[PDB]
Point group: C2
């Protein structure tokens, strides 16, 4: 019911990235699912704007949207890609691919 990290396996061929990513075929990216509603959790680490916007959304549900549960910290992965010369080069830290922590923003 609340903002938390859940599993998401992403296949590179389904997102159109298998044309430049040789390996791996799939990877655990995770996704941040849940709702930002009161009472909040102890580890959602909400900003004061996300708390204010959620309160305004309660008073005006048609004019203002609630806060979103988005990843607050990302972890890199390693991909085997083909460079301009068609050889498999290793990108050891491809940053911003997996979710480490979620939160209400």
């Amino acid at each position: 019911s609340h903002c938390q990290k859940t599993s998401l396996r992403v296949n590179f061929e389904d997102i159109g990235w298998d044309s430049w990513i040789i390996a791996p075929k799939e990877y655990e990216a995770y996704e941040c699912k849940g709702g930002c509603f009161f009472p909040l959790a102890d580890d959602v680490t909400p900003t004061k704007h996300a708390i204010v916007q959620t309160l305004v959304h309660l008073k005006f549900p048609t004019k203002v949207s609630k806060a979103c549960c988005v990843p607050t910290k990302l972890s890199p992965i390693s991909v085997l890609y083909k460079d301009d010369m068609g050889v498999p080069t290793l990108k050891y830290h491809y940053e911003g691919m997996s979710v480490a922590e979620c939160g209400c923003r």
Copy 2:
């Protein structure tokens, strides 16, 4: 149509904060409105997970949600609050209250 910053005036008495915030009565908090869909904008600064999740949402619209346009940088404001001794104390930098930049996360 795309992730951008828009105006949001928040009244402290409508969110139940006028009991500990004497002044100001209202403040410009801003809100991040728009959609994270391709083709993206030049200044939404999207993370690679937000791009991947948006691509997975296109292939599986019922199983995975799209990325959210949330504030990426917050600016503080100044509030006049009553401390435990009932006097108006000034909190010069009340951080995390106004939106500075939006983005797709």
